[PDB]
């Protein structure tokens, strides 16, 4: 199959405005949310129907308890960072963990933290060490690296358990995750040529312009891949017309193993 990934995010906020949760945790398979938990509901809940339909209530009950523990841990950790930074006011703490199963069968695994939305600590599961961005992170690095067994545990989770979870969820959601919806592609004149694609799944797509059979990366404007709201995506790319000389322009789209060319006459 194509490349797929599993990742879990956590967000803690130290002094949230009224109503807004102190803690949020959301899981994703590829671009799809699968799970959610926050400090207001204090419940882990499905975010995709093929998760709800395949995981029994004991799963949600058990991880609800773990998440209540992780929420308290996240608050303690953020309190410690903000004390060490000598920071007043509201600050954020984030974690991301997960893995990728690549098309060729290889795997990757990652775990990192951020403070105020910037890299703070990054785990290297091959050297079994934490990269620190500053001296507050460095203090935390020292304490985490003194617990060699927890490092080994995280390497095992990233390399073995995460990949097993991903394969299990990929099969649960195979009707959604493993389908293909090819793009509808057109060109219009707006002077610039706009190559537009819509209606496609998965969101990964490569669109570019060629000028007489040569790519022009520096002159091409690349639009974002955007959710259309119905489970499919849209995207575009534009290139500016030289009004002083004609050229053979052509838009090239690659999606899910199929290449297409729209040669503009």
């Amino acid at each position: 199959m194509r490349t797929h990934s599993l990742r879990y995010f956590r967000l803690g906020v130290s002094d949230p405005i009224h109503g807004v949760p102190e803690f949020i945790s959301v899981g994703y398979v590829d671009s799809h949310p699968i799970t959610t938990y926050d400090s207001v509901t204090r419940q882990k809940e499905p975010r995709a129907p093929w998760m709800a339909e395949n995981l029994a209530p004991d799963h949600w009950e058990r991880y609800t308890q773990l998440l209540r523990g992780w929420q308290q841990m996240f608050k303690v950790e953020l309190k410690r960072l903000q004390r060490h930074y000598n920071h007043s006011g509201s600050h954020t703490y984030q974690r991301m963990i997960g893995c990728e199963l690549l098309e060729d069968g290889s795997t990757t695994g990652f775990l990192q933290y951020a403070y105020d939305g910037q890299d703070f600590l990054i785990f290297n599961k091959d050297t079994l060490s934490w990269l620190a961005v500053d001296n507050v992170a460095h203090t935390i690095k020292q304490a985490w690296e003194a617990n060699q067994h927890e490092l080994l545990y995280q390497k095992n989770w990233l390399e073995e358990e995460c990949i097993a979870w991903l394969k299990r969820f990929l099969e649960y959601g195979k009707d959604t995750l493993q389908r293909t919806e090819p793009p509808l592609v057109r060109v219009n004149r707006k002077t610039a040529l706009f190559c537009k694609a819509h209606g496609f799944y998965p969101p990964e797509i490569y669109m570019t312009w060629m000028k007489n059979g040569e790519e022009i990366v520096q002159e091409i404007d690349y639009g974002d891949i955007l959710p259309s709201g119905d489970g499919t995506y849209q995207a575009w790319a534009s290139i500016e017309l030289d009004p002083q000389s004609s050229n053979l322009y052509s838009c090239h789209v690659e999606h899910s193993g199929v290449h297409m060319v729209l040669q503009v006459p």
Partner: antibody, heavy 109, light 116 residues
Framework: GQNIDQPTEMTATEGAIVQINCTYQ??????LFWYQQHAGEAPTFLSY??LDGLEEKGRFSSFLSRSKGYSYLLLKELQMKDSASYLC??????????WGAGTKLIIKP | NAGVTQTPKFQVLKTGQSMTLQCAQD?????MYWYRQDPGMGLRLIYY???????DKGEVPNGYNVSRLNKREFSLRLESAAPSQTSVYFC??????????????FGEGSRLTVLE
């Protein structure tokens, strides 16, 4: 279901070596623990393994093979005070601890 | 520096009698557990508390209830004792839970015998 197996009882001679085996079949694996429990007392933590290989800690070493689903606790230069039960335990995919029934180690002076 | 302190060490009960076992830990741990140990089988979790302010059932919750009173204390209640609850009960705690490598610290054990 998930199962963990270890022999009920083992007997060895003072000064010798003993290997206590633990085999597990679990849904996911987040590490294997060994505990010592003297008769009438609380279990206390001996070792943790989660990657493959041998780890040493005094006269005790603990080995793990994830692919075989196997660990042993190796006790060298046995002494009478090693007479105790030895409990194996495995954390499954959901961090639930699955406990073996324990191996009673008897040491002949 | 006492670790995990549970009481009582021994107790005899008549079928139908109520009993509370106390457990406290002074290690600033977040997770607490109540286990029973019976001949011929591995420890079985009765109830646990992953953090202050939450509790949930273990493998053998029926006939028991728990109260995580504060960060330090986790009491186990037998409302109507049954002969099958004759056992050795162990309270335990750990720094956090889900931390894969974190080990358990056990109390000294409470031996209950329930008689008709």
């Amino acid at each position: 279901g998930q199962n963990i197996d270890q022999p009920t009882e083992m007997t060895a001679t003072e000064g010798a070596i003993v290997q206590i085996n633990c085999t597990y079949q679990t849904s996911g694996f987040n590490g294997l623990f060994w505990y010592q429990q003297h008769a009438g007392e609380a279990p206390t933590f001996l070792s943790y393994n989660v990657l493959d290989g041998l780890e040493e800690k005094g006269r005790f070493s603990s080995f793990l093979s994830r692919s075989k689903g196997y660990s042993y606790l190796l006790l060298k230069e046995l002494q009478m005070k090693d007479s105790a039960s030895y409990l194996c335990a495995v954390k499954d995919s959901n961090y639930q601890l699955i406990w073996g029934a324990g191996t009673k180690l008897i040491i002949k002076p | 520096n006492a670790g995990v302190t549970q009481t009582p060490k021994f107790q005899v009960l008549k079928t139908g009698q109520s009993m509370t076992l106390q457990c406290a830990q002074d290690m600033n741990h977040n997770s607490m557990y109540w286990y029973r140990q019976d001949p011929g089988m591995g420890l079985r979790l009765i109830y646990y508390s992953a953090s202050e302010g939450t509790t949930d059932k273990g493998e053998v919750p029926n006939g028991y209830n728990v109260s995580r009173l504060n960060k330090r204390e986790f009491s186990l209640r037998l409302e109507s004792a049954a002969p099958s609850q004759t056992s050795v009960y162990f309270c335990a705690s750990s720094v956090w839970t889900g931390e894969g490598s974190g080990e358990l610290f056990f109390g000294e054990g409470s031996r209950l015998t329930v008689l008709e």
